[PDB]
């Protein structure tokens, strides 16, 4: 139950302390919500994009004819989406190329010219022309009548008459004209005719057909003119305009567009697109080289070359293979027939030129014709526009149509000869084929390599099941080890380049050719069926653009937000431990488990609020949109628990906070590194190995975060229904396993932390054995009175400290009895605190035992601590609480009611003198009040043993009275142990006394026993203000000894005969010295008997030697500091480089590279699946059998042959056709409302703006009714889609099918991959074969060409040529591109069915088949796309790790600067004169050489791993200059921060985190924003940021480390193909600009730190005038207006009550704090204006030790001599004098941090006197010094006062302010109360004779003898008494009966009642 109360109190304290910060807390719970702001914005920069449907054009294969094959290659290069069903996916069409102008032209030509009433008589004209040219024109070699000649003759003959002429000649050139001319009317006029048509004049089989030739042209006149003006011809001529204009169009910009709309037609704009070579011609190698070396067409040529010019290598040399590949080269045969035809031109051309130059039928017929009749004949429907425009015979400027023909038709012949059309080479082994392929690959002249495995080189007969292989290289083939993607994306997979490697790589074409060869080799009656391929359409979907960066940034940004919390809690666990605040709590009796429970609750309650805020931002910021808030909350909660218990585990390794701040973040982030292995071993990990590694909590976090992201990139969330099932196929270890294996780690970490705490409590506390689970649960010394009881007992201790060697404590034997106070005295290095640290469990002994209640602490500390109280020598308080809160907290921890605690606190506040504060923080107290509170809270509660040492060192004589009252009130029932130095109280209130010397007792017992043990006598005191006089004056009554002590302004005499003594004092009274005082024997004389030069500085250096001495001094100081703390150096310098080393070592382990397997291609590589078919175009025989042999007899493919196929996929039976039943609502819906042909079914609603979905909803009216189904023997479901809209069915049914796949197996699946569709016709050119060649032959015979030798070969192959450009009857296959190997599988299905559908009717088609196999060529490679992404992914994280590492080193230099700024050790060096510039410059110079070691170590690692892009002969200087100049730039940026943090560890943590935040969120935003080149507003931001963000060195390093890595991948990919460009990474665009910004920054920030340093920094000396100091938070002044002056040779006093303003004055004088309204002058130089000038005329000794705890005592003196003049050859004797004079010989070199606490004061005053400054300021120079050392200090001060130097002291011991001081000044709250000499005070204040006795019976003893008395005190067996000035005290001394004592007046009693009265 008390457990719960203590929990509540601890939590109350923590939350009270947090109520004061309100900034360390807000930053604490806001820091993680800050790494996500970039993502929150960058999400809303990119709203989601919804994509329309896609419909794609089909692809003809080589077997579909050459013309559509090539046309499809050209038109469908980019594979465009069309959004509306293309014509090719209609039941009986394949064409898909209308709206092409070249096709509409044919449409109009068939519609108008031909098949009409104008083409009837045209052939008759041709036939009559041929008859003419055969009969009348050709009349030379044949016999005829006289009227005949090759040109012209006359038949004039048979003349019987004798032999006007012009008239007849004109007239002939008339039937009734010659009849009346008369003879010639009976012989030559018999059958004569006129000039009419003589076409009837010949002897011909037909009568005549003339007078119709010109009378048929008018019929077809309105047809041609109509045609030419049709819109199709307008478009043709419009687009052909920029072709013949001067020859040559623009290369690939508009030429492609013209050819596109000329051949292709695609609408809506063209779719969306989602060395001297040998055996060649000097043209063909010039062309290829000009094409390859043009950096614009190298890419397309790189892919097109192996098909145009590559070669195909086939393995065995057998007649079977030769036959197959003879039948497979049909395509190349019909491709070289074209070359033949075009080559025939080089022969026909000159013949046509001649015929149209000379002709008997043109140049002698048409040039000879006359024109009178022609003009009228033309006009009745131009000779000048015809017979001259096209019939010229001599040059005129007809050639316009002939000299473009050769230009355009010989260039084509030059082009076509570059093709290689013989490409089948024959080998005898796959090995030989492989080496020849290796040879050919470099030239890029390797197509595939075909292998027939089952046939031997003698094979002749084909088996009826042929299998072959196509072996290509991996860069043009899909991988054969996996068949799909790892995760189901939502897209069609339709990128023409990287998703269609089976098409542009040439695999599918060769497979088609060889399947057709195999079919044609064993059928002999093949069906001419061709094949088209069609891609199944895809619905509308939603694009992301975001989960490409989200999935690569989420599980870094999520694990990196907790690094600040981890560091701030591991550091806070360790501050309490090494600041000793855990041990005070454990001393007040707080259990050990309450500590841990409070830590856990207080950490959990703070992490749980940032968890909440983080979830709210993650969801409402739309980073995750589909998931569940509650599950995310619970996941983060489990992580919080794991991380907290990890922090508890880590805190038990460290003891110093600065060391834990430097390791916690690095270790937290190095436990996450094993997630590098997820890049290479992505698939070869197992759920069991995944469990084994998830014991490290961050990797379990990463495993869970990946599922969180992935369930969303698959369109779902983390709903409560799919935790336990992974998204990826066939892997265990779901999300729940990560969540559940976080809690196992929480438990394990916590349990181990609890155990490991007990065994290794470093540096404060007692360890346990590693097996503590065996469950234990004369004479010097006074005679011992057998009475009271013993309390604490000590028995033979030893404590050896390892370095020092000597025993600090050596065999003690003491007992402290119960009901009394003991005083525990000794010199300084005695063992008083080392012993009292052992009685309490602060540190373990080397030997011996102690016993508190008879129970030894070696086993029973828990019970001992239940009743303890303690105050330590140096204060430890919660520096932000209050006085009242301290006392109200410790009182209740012991267990008390709240109101009783109020009462006790109220009493003790007044009792201790700490009232009037009661509300001030424990840091605004002075240093005596802190020591006073530290005692007050040792008595509160109720202890039984109270151990309190040095309880009064620093408290003024007026408050020591209250402390004594407090001690004597609680002595009643406790054992109290006091350790003290000043002896006024060691005897007054000590019931016993013990003394230690060198770590063991020297004496013991009650004080009276000690006195007679050593000696006793009176002590005559003569306080002066000449020795010979006194000596002779005390010779008259010469006793024992004489002068025993004589220091400045003091004296001492010892004298053991009433008249003798009586006469002395009496006579002395009336007869140079001032007052005096006799006594019995002090307690300081017996303690004093137990234990038992450089006055000028000549020539202090100055100038450049002084500066060069300062630099050396500081560098040596820093070297000494860092040699002795090497764990800190290791953990701050070498650790980050080790982190980098681990990160690079991990990215080296990679799986070995095997080889790509076989993978027989068939549709059952996939699982259960649907297929379909569609028997379009029925009734045609030869298709009713092809639709029968792919359903019923063997079915699809080869999974059911007669013998067997692959005994891995067994058959079975089938089921009857069965149309499934549908719900009635559909039945009424589809018949009720009338639909149409273009709208068969209701449409699907997409993913609305506010209705986000992955795929549309598609209501219950999808593409129709369910079609008939069946289950085939292949264990597949094919559904018959005959006479239905397939494009509608597939599109509107894909979504509902994708949902029905994750109900059972939670991973989404694709259940449909393809199907056949029998039918499809395209119209073949109606022109037959032999008819064409006959027409050509007749035309040639008319036109006198006769051809030539080439033409007979060219025109020998026309009939077969025209049969191979079209097919007219063919099928088409549909495929789904999501499955990689789904194209070739179904292509094989189709070819195999075509084979079975055509073999004869007695061969049983169930045992014939073809199978294909892929098997890449053994080149030992990977695909480029794989290694590129792997390399960039790995080499990004290396840059991330280097940035993380170099972000921690720069903050490591602030630890020393902050550590020195507080404790006032930097100010104490400025006092010696170091001129801030040299200090800062030297620190910078040390930091640089400290940094360069880490930089060099990182570089050495990069060299060792041989990482390119970093260690290459062109990059290494760039890397070195990046690192070495980043450090220069960034180091002087931490320095201004050392001015506002007080705890070094806090600064370390808060600066490392800020550096990491900037260095991550500057070098990722500009690499993400540049990735998005789509958006235009992003480029503005990217450009402006890449310049604004240059002021941070973090950006300048983050850019460069990733640039040098990106700009080497782009060259190592070039090495794959082509040339190899170098880097030169120094350009003013890569890193050259950053390296310039570094240098400017590195010198602008240093000036900023030197500027911020400046905002913070008569015959007498030190004249003070009215000066004041009001502290900011109060109302009354700390130091009111005060004014003095000190002369050269005096010593000022500066006494004062506790809390009066004495250290504030010294702080203002030395220049620490800021004066308020005053002035002060040291040697003429004022302190307000020029203070660097006064600083060299004074020394300073602070109240608190300002020393470096790691050098030594001697190295301090050397440092502080060098920081002054004292040239290099004198420092040794100055140091030796200072060491010897102050008493530091035993331990002059022992690590000043191990001094005792009275030796630290000696060191401080020793280094306050180096040099010889005229003014010396000392502040409490003697608080922990024993009486032996105080005298040595007094002697030194007297020796320096005698020179002429001034001293100012501030002390609280009045034994010395009257021994060496000349002027005093009591100082109450503000200014002074009473200045003046010592005698000026005593005389006016206090008569004298303060008689003190020891012992009612003595109270009445001063009734008549001494009436005037006034009582001072009434204590225990000691009490004081003031008696009036009677001078008869020694007279009445014979009336006593005790401790004799009387004195004139001590200054101690004067100061008590001086301050009593105010
Ligand atoms: N940082 C501070 N803020 C507010 N008040 C302060 C601060 N430091 C000191 N004081 C107050 O100013 C007064 C002067 O304190 P100062 O340190 O001069 O006392 P002191 O005489 O040096 O004490 P002691 O004599 O024990 O050394 C004290 O009352 C103290 O409470
Ligand atoms: C040309 O294509 C159009 C486009 O739909 C089609 O309607 C027409 O039937 C086609 N003409 C043919 C193939 O002759
Ligand atoms: C036609 O081009 C040829 C070049 O092949 C040229 O010699 C001839 O002169 C051109 N025709 C005319 C009419 O000039
Ligand atoms: C190709 O590599 C595979 C890898 O195992 C090996 O089995 C096969 O024999 C090799 N064949 C050739 C022709 O290199
Ligand atoms: C559709 O028909 C079903 C019966 O199958 C009926 O329950 C429902 O009310 C009808 N209307 C709808 C679903 O809008
Ligand atoms: Mg001590
Ligand atoms: Mg002080």
Numbering used by the authors: 1 to 163, 209 to 218, 231 to 239, 243 to 334, 361 to 455, 460 to 471, 476 to 491, 499 to 878, ...
What does the paper say about this structure?
ABCA4 (also known as ABCR or the rim protein) is a retinal-specific member of the ABCA subfamily predominantly expressed in the outer segment disk membranes of photoreceptor cells, and was the first ABCA transporter that has been linked to genetic disease. Available evidence suggested that ABCA4 may act as a flippase to translocate N-retinylidene-phosphatidylethanolamine (NRPE), a reversible covalent adduct of all-trans retinal (ATR) and phosphatidylethanolamine (PE), from the luminal leaflet to the cytoplasmic leaflet of the disk membrane. Here, we show the molecular structures of human ABCA4 determined in three distinct functional states by single-particle cryo-EM to 3.3–3.4 Å. These structures delineate the conformational transitions of ABCA4 to flip NRPE and suggest a “lateral access and extrusion” mechanism for ABCA4-mediated NRPE recognition and translocation, a mechanism that might also be adopted by other ABCA transporters.
